Design an enzyme around this catalytic site. Sequence first.
Site, PDB file in Angstrom:
ATOM      1  N   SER A  62       0.738  -1.274  -0.035  1.00  0.00           N
ATOM      2  CA  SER A  62      -0.031   0.056  -0.097  1.00  0.00           C
ATOM      3  C   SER A  62       0.749   1.280  -0.021  1.00  0.00           C
ATOM      4  CB  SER A  62      -1.178  -0.050   0.883  1.00  0.00           C
ATOM      5  OG  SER A  62      -0.339   0.339   2.387  1.00  0.00           O
ATOM      6  N   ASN A  74       1.140  -4.812 -14.529  1.00  0.00           N
ATOM      7  CA  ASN A  74       0.335  -6.186 -14.898  1.00  0.00           C
ATOM      8  C   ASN A  74      -0.542  -6.392 -13.599  1.00  0.00           C
ATOM      9  OD1 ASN A  74       2.201  -6.918 -12.708  1.00  0.00           O
ATOM     10  ND2 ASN A  74       2.642  -8.898 -13.624  1.00  0.00           N
ATOM     11  N   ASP A  80       4.085 -18.587 -12.054  1.00  0.00           N
ATOM     12  CA  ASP A  80       3.377 -19.840 -12.365  1.00  0.00           C
ATOM     13  C   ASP A  80       4.454 -20.966 -11.542  1.00  0.00           C
ATOM     14  OD1 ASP A  80       1.578 -19.566 -14.821  1.00  0.00           O
ATOM     15  OD2 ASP A  80       3.238 -18.305 -15.340  1.00  0.00           O
ATOM     16  N   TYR A  83       7.881 -21.791 -13.117  1.00  0.00           N
ATOM     17  CA  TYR A  83       8.784 -20.662 -12.930  1.00  0.00           C
ATOM     18  C   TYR A  83       9.606 -20.908 -11.976  1.00  0.00           C
ATOM     19  CZ  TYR A  83      10.695 -15.793 -14.026  1.00  0.00           C
ATOM     20  OH  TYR A  83      11.400 -14.903 -14.233  1.00  0.00           O
ATOM     21  N   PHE A  91      10.298 -10.610 -10.862  1.00  0.00           N
ATOM     22  CA  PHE A  91      10.638  -9.254 -11.434  1.00  0.00           C
ATOM     23  C   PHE A  91       9.237  -8.330 -10.962  1.00  0.00           C
ATOM     24  CE2 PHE A  91       9.277 -11.383 -15.066  1.00  0.00           C
ATOM     25  CZ  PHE A  91       8.107 -10.660 -15.320  1.00  0.00           C
TER      26      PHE A  91
HETATM   27  O1  LIG Z   1       4.770  -9.742 -11.784  1.00  0.00           O
HETATM   28  C1  LIG Z   1       5.536 -10.763 -12.367  1.00  0.00           C
HETATM   29  C2  LIG Z   1       4.836 -11.343 -13.397  1.00  0.00           C
HETATM   30  C3  LIG Z   1       5.362 -12.697 -13.771  1.00  0.00           C
HETATM   31  N1  LIG Z   1       6.696 -12.976 -13.306  1.00  0.00           N
HETATM   32  C4  LIG Z   1       7.288 -14.078 -14.006  1.00  0.00           C
HETATM   33  C5  LIG Z   1       6.925 -15.604 -13.496  1.00  0.00           C
HETATM   34  C6  LIG Z   1       5.684 -15.821 -14.341  1.00  0.00           C
HETATM   35  O2  LIG Z   1       5.289 -17.452 -14.206  1.00  0.00           O
HETATM   36  C7  LIG Z   1       6.260 -15.393 -15.756  1.00  0.00           C
HETATM   37  C8  LIG Z   1       5.223 -15.248 -16.728  1.00  0.00           C
HETATM   38  O3  LIG Z   1       4.331 -14.092 -16.539  1.00  0.00           O
HETATM   39  O4  LIG Z   1       6.905 -14.061 -15.618  1.00  0.00           O
HETATM   40  C9  LIG Z   1       7.267 -12.047 -12.383  1.00  0.00           C
HETATM   41  O5  LIG Z   1       8.586 -12.458 -12.121  1.00  0.00           O
HETATM   42  N2  LIG Z   1       6.667 -11.046 -12.101  1.00  0.00           N
HETATM   43  O1  LIG Z   2      -5.657  -0.671  -0.002  1.00  0.00           O
HETATM   44  C1  LIG Z   2      -5.642  -0.962   1.149  1.00  0.00           C
HETATM   45  C2  LIG Z   2      -4.553  -1.564   1.486  1.00  0.00           C
HETATM   46  C3  LIG Z   2      -3.825  -1.661   2.850  1.00  0.00           C
HETATM   47  N1  LIG Z   2      -4.776  -1.240   3.730  1.00  0.00           N
HETATM   48  C4  LIG Z   2      -4.740  -1.375   5.126  1.00  0.00           C
HETATM   49  C5  LIG Z   2      -4.967  -2.756   5.491  1.00  0.00           C
HETATM   50  C6  LIG Z   2      -3.236  -3.332   5.911  1.00  0.00           C
HETATM   51  O2  LIG Z   2      -3.366  -4.398   6.706  1.00  0.00           O
HETATM   52  C7  LIG Z   2      -2.441  -1.992   6.199  1.00  0.00           C
HETATM   53  C8  LIG Z   2      -1.170  -2.214   5.607  1.00  0.00           C
HETATM   54  O3  LIG Z   2      -1.024  -2.774   4.017  1.00  0.00           O
HETATM   55  O4  LIG Z   2      -3.350  -0.982   5.366  1.00  0.00           O
HETATM   56  C9  LIG Z   2      -5.900  -0.771   3.411  1.00  0.00           C
HETATM   57  O5  LIG Z   2      -6.798  -0.303   4.275  1.00  0.00           O
HETATM   58  N2  LIG Z   2      -6.642  -0.514   2.043  1.00  0.00           N
HETATM   59 MG   LIG Z   3       1.974 -16.476 -19.420  1.00  0.00          MG
END
Ligand SMILES: O=c1ccn([C@H]2C[C@H](O)[C@@H](CO)O2)c(=O)[nH]1
Ligand SMILES: O=c1ccn([C@H]2C[C@H](O)[C@@H](CO)O2)c(=O)[nH]1
Ligand SMILES: [Mg+2]
Lengths: 142, 142, 142
Positions: A62, A74, A80, A83, A91
């Site tokens: 947050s 994304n 997956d 992976y 990443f």
């Molecule tokens: O936010 C992401 C999204 C994907 N992946 C890697 C793992 C996943 O299996 C592959 C295909 O999206 O890319 C990441 O490291 N971070």
């Molecule tokens: O969208 C959000 C994300 C987090 N929190 C609160 C709950 C959570 O345990 C704390 C720290 O991420 O902040 C929210 O209220 N809304």
């Molecule tokens: Mg894919």
Amino acid sequence: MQIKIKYLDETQTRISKIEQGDWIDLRAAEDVTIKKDEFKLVPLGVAMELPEGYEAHVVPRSSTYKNFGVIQTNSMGVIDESYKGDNDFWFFPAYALRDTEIKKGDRICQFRIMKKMPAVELVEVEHLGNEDRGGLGSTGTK
Amino acid sequence: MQIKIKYLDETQTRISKIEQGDWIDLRAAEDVTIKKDEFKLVPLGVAMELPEGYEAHVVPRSSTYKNFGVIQTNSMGVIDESYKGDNDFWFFPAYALRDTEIKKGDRICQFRIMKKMPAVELVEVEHLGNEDRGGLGSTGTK
Amino acid sequence: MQIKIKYLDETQTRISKIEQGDWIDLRAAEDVTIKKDEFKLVPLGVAMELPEGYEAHVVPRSSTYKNFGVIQTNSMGVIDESYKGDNDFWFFPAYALRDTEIKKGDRICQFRIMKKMPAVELVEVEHLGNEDRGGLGSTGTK
Ligand SMILES: O=c1ccn([C@H]2C[C@H](O)[C@@H](CO)O2)c(=O)[nH]1
Ligand SMILES: O=c1ccn([C@H]2C[C@H](O)[C@@H](CO)O2)c(=O)[nH]1
Ligand SMILES: [Mg+2]
Ligand SMILES: O=c1ccn([C@H]2C[C@H](O)[C@@H](CO)O2)c(=O)[nH]1
Ligand SMILES: [Mg+2]
Ligand SMILES: [Mg+2]
């Protein structure tokens, strides 16, 4: 259960579970600077093998926007189960809404594991035979 | 388990489970072009009836920004179990961060099913009686 | 099961499960005004204790962009089980893509509960010894 974790190198700060965090914070593997309205993959310096049958999900903290001015392009990353190779490093795809600097070791996102969806048969049909729900704000706003 | 799937028409490319994908890729039902800083609903060309008690979640692929310059405005779309009528076609709400073209059949997002949360009673209280956690970066950044 | 809910005051509109909604809608606790490319926390006006071992997830409604012009900067908010103090009030972190106004009681986002991930042991390894999957679009686009 167990997760096998391989760090990119010995300079990576080890991740860990904290009492009040249901998800586990992940860390930038190196310093990364990003200009307003640009995109950068932020390496997280970890590769993992998850327990059999599990995937992982990655979302921002947050405070990520507040502290770093980035959003995750994304939305929620899906790691997956497959992976899990020695070069399959996680990443965080960041888009900067303002000029920013992220330092090595900074906690910029969080992950958890979850069972993958079960095996599903996709059955093609001509007609579904249900009433329409509608969508995109059909239930209004008030 | 089984998912009934109704395609918008015979020109839609059929969706498929792939070995290394824990979620299933969905596809643009038509060519869509979106200008920088504009919004467009991208039709996905599929209506589904999910197994009893299940919802679906839809997110971008990690490569969607790279390949198409869009983000998903609702972050993770929730397909309600009741969205299973013959006209309840799924969509991807796209916001373009650069000028873009998405072609018919392009895999732009991915989905999985999950059991809906259980029935919950909402019990109104005057005091919760627990210590405050705090939030929004209370654990810091380092 | 039960969720204890404590509202910010007696003028918050009470939240409710609807038939066609698998997730529960949450409301703006006050009018909030936001200007284009600026950020604001929208207070949601509730504090909850969830059932034992559960977390909550909060995402925008599909119509939040259409209706209110905002994205959610953390994508999906994770509400830690431990965020159940009397002052632990939920928020929705909004970034405005257009100038916007949100009114007290507007349904701007939605939430569900889920079981937290299990206790996991992080085992440090040198080599994972599995074949690499690759990522960031290794499966292509067509
Ligand atoms: O936010 C992401 C999204 C994907 N992946 C890697 C793992 C996943 O299996 C592959 C295909 O999206 O890319 C990441 O490291 N971070
Ligand atoms: O969208 C959000 C994300 C987090 N929190 C609160 C709950 C959570 O345990 C704390 C720290 O991420 O902040 C929210 O209220 N809304
Ligand atoms: Mg894919
Ligand atoms: O990204 C989304 C989000 C929702 N819906 C549909 C199904 C859902 O039940 C309805 C209202 O959110 O809109 C989509 O097609 N895509
Ligand atoms: Mg945290
Ligand atoms: Mg809804």
